[PDB]
Symmetry: C5
Subunit: 249 residues, 5 copies
């Protein structure tokens, strides 16, 4: 896997030059990834909200794949992806430890602005997920904000294993195969109940700007984002980055 490792390492060095030399480009590109994932979340929640509970995992997982397709094919900068690229970049010597930790929070924030931005436009566009309190947007958001730390951490680990696996298979494949790679892993992660930090940003923002109940708070959103973010970072850094690094000649 030295070819795939070098391409990821070349990418870590590209992310850095963008961060350092083109600040405007970096921020636009990070906000893009959040908006793109968010457009996917609006799609899957719209469809889930109309359907019986027993088919939601299947339809929402099967139709979420647009989210990473946009991110990877359209082009953008996705925090959860950075956790792997930047690990590989550090391990190969194309970027440093300090550059890694300085870039990640930046991608995280741009993703956030882009998520809030798409949920805002959806809200001004009078989106139908928003005004009714029984909307799946609110009950999924609330449940997400009140789950224990451990549960959220490990769900965040599992999600980013798959999402990074999708990034990884897409770099190793061509044409349509990238699309199937993306499709598969997004099905597995949504249907299986795992947690994606950047997907959550849009979900939480959608619930915030609608008729959420009193028990839904900025704190609870903070809680979920803290622990999912760490767990996404575990799988990205260790399962995938260090994992494949240690797997090659």
């Amino acid at each position: 896997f030295t070819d795939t490792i070098n391409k990821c390492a070349a990418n870590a060095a590209r992310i850095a030059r963008l961060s350092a030399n083109n600040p405007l480009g970096f921020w636009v590109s990070s906000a893009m990834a959040g908006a793109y994932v968010g457009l996917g979340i609006i799609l899957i929640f719209t469809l889930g909200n109309l359907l019986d509970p027993s088919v939601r995992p299947l339809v929402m997982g099967a139709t979420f794949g647009i989210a990473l397709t946009l991110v990877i094919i359209a082009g953008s900068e996705l925090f959860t992806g950075h956790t792997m690229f930047l690990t590989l970049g550090v391990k190969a010597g194309t970027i440093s430890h300090g550059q890694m930790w300085a870039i990640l929070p930046q991608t995280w924030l741009g993703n956030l602005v882009g998520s809030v931005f798409v949920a805002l436009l959806y809200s001004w566009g009078g989106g139908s997920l928003l005004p009714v309190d029984t909307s799946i947007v609110h009950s999924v958001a609330l449940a997400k904000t009140t789950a224990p730390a451990t549960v959220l951490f490990f769900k965040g680990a599992l999600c980013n294993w798959l999402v990074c696996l999708a990034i990884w298979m897409a770099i190793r494949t061509e044409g349509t195969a990238k699309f199937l790679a993306i499709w598969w892993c997004l099905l597995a992660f949504i249907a299986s109940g795992y947690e994606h930090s950047v997907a959550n940003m849009t979900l939480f923002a959608l619930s915030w700007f609608g008729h959420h109940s009193d028990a839904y708070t900025l704190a609870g959103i903070g809680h979920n984002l803290l622990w999912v973010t760490l767990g996404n970072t575990l799988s990205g850094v260790v399962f995938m980055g260090l994992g494949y690094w240690y797997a090659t000649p």
Copy 2:
């Protein structure tokens, strides 16, 4: 890369300009084509939607709308919502003037209308089953689209053309079947999410207009919708996509 994609977008912008200036009959036929192609897709999804529960309409209408941008891009034609992106990029790369951009756009818009109205007419002469029946989802959706407020329609128009331009963008960055999938994804996301396409609406509105529509459904209502939806489509084409990618490049 990003620069490669942008240059292709700017070359396409210079190509549209010329087509407009040098070959007007082709410009109009190609424009009429895009409107008709989107409408054929509108006839398809509305015929399917009319036979389904509300709770599966968005999914099945969304999953079967892909043909619309597929025809526009693969068969070849000129689509207004597409130009909003290409022309911006041509202006910014320098291959066309700001002037040519704003002179082309209303031409593409009108051409599309001609094809949209044209395909709705044929369908009507063709005893299309969606027109005469006052309970059809053609009349009800077209009614709701005409009386939604401006802000709502604007922002749904913005969200629609982000996605449709993303399809355009992604089809250019990819090859063979990947093109059909990118298009598929984005048309499913836009339809199922509730967003608004000016050009597709031109077909839907002409279908409702030619059938037994609500006495509440007016030319003024059609005007209200096409106005704010168009402006919306334009914001995302120009700013989120055209300018957005322009500033993302190092």
Copy 3:
């Protein structure tokens, strides 16, 4: 754009012409093949539709009709409805004469009919389950097609061949799998929207004819549909596609 595609259609038209005049036998085999292939498609979707609720018949029958044109294009055969486009572009490019176009089209038509009647015969001798019951959708759909007004039939036939020629067009402009997707989309769209395919009707008509059809179903009814559906197919092939794309090239 479009110059390469047009030249390919035009080279195809000369090839069709050479085939017709130099190897008449292969002309007929290859035309019979197209009617038979389209037929194997019609048997498929009527078998499926025959068991489902009327409300999902357009979706299912549309989604599964793709094989028909996939066979025609990828296995290789001669389809009258595609000939309407190819030959038009051939006359326009100068590769064949007006005279050659009109001498050929009726032959392709006749060959398609032979292959159609023929695949229907085999299905019958094969004790196909669609035939013996009066309630079969083969009988109710064939009869509805035969008593429909000329006007309705024409414009539906025009709308159909737009879509089928669009599939042929897009297939010429793409490679590998994308051909199959282009074809799938267009056949979803024409069948599910209600549109009329002249050659595909030939098989349906023969299947109902060889089965337990009602007395209301006559050869005059069949000829009535085939006349207007054919003329309508020919309109969209010749004008919307042939002449359309001819005047669209800068």
Copy 4:
């Protein structure tokens, strides 16, 4: 010259003759595989059709049978029903004689029969759930196939192998995934239209024979269906496809 596709069919016929004549073991292995592979598809579609209302069987069983000819063509093996076509083109092209063609065909049919019986037996030792209930789908369909009339069976086998060969033919004229979709289309059209495949039947009949069939189901019955379907299969492969495309150029 001939067409590329005809020249390819005919090279394939010459390669069949050589395998038959120089490598009997290879031939028998490679024919056994095709029977097993079609058989694997048959177990699949009957396991699914078993749980489904009759009105969705032709659709679901049709839509899921594509693996059968996918294994045959992509994995690699010798299928009787495709030989009828290949060997005709060889004969017309001059690469093989009428003599080699008629000597090979029965060998292919038998090796296919062996692999079909072999995969049935494994499934049967594997406690296959389709076996014990004489009223469930393998036994009722198996029974009705053995008592159908000769004319009906012959013309159904004609229309089946038209489609199965059209799949073979289109797979030769295409690359990559297009081959898979060609095959998939064709096996949906033949299984859902009610058409009969001699080799597919060999596994169905072997499943019903080795399971708890009613005593109305007999060896003479199985022989009755196989005789007429094999003959119909041969009519369309030889004539509609081989002779058909031979005279189409």
Copy 5:
């Protein structure tokens, strides 16, 4: 025929033998991955199956299991069940010794075990919904698997790995998305037919064990299944695929 593929597979055995001898860490990781990857596919299909009517479980669980071997092959990892085929062919071609095959084989097995157990464990710590409710299909499918007769499990294992090696074999002989379709088809077929995969069972078992299983579900039972399905898996890997294609070549 098949000589290239055999030789790819033989060259793969030699690569495997090299990883094992000069990079045990990399070996173990790459084994564990494969087990964890399969386990992800298992967690998916059981989560889907659990909410569904039993009459659509084989279809849906089969149609969605594809990710398992797709991760294995396309991301890359080392899969015991694949090894049974690779190593056999390398032995026959002379690229590895009999001695190597037998040293490596239970190594991959253990690594796959460690990985399957590992993903199960993460899913337990992440409050996986499949675990706590006794009637969950993770528990009932797990139990039925553990008490089935040796002979039954053996021949279901042989038939499973026939299919899985066929996917791997077809993936080797194809490109691009085709690798993906070959895999999807084989995993549909094996999961929906009732066949038994040793490594996937490893995850399913760990899951049950970490959840609310009945008293009747024991380690001896998990043992019984892992024994006989592994052995059946090995039969079809070695003999039906390995020696099978080996003796199928001129």
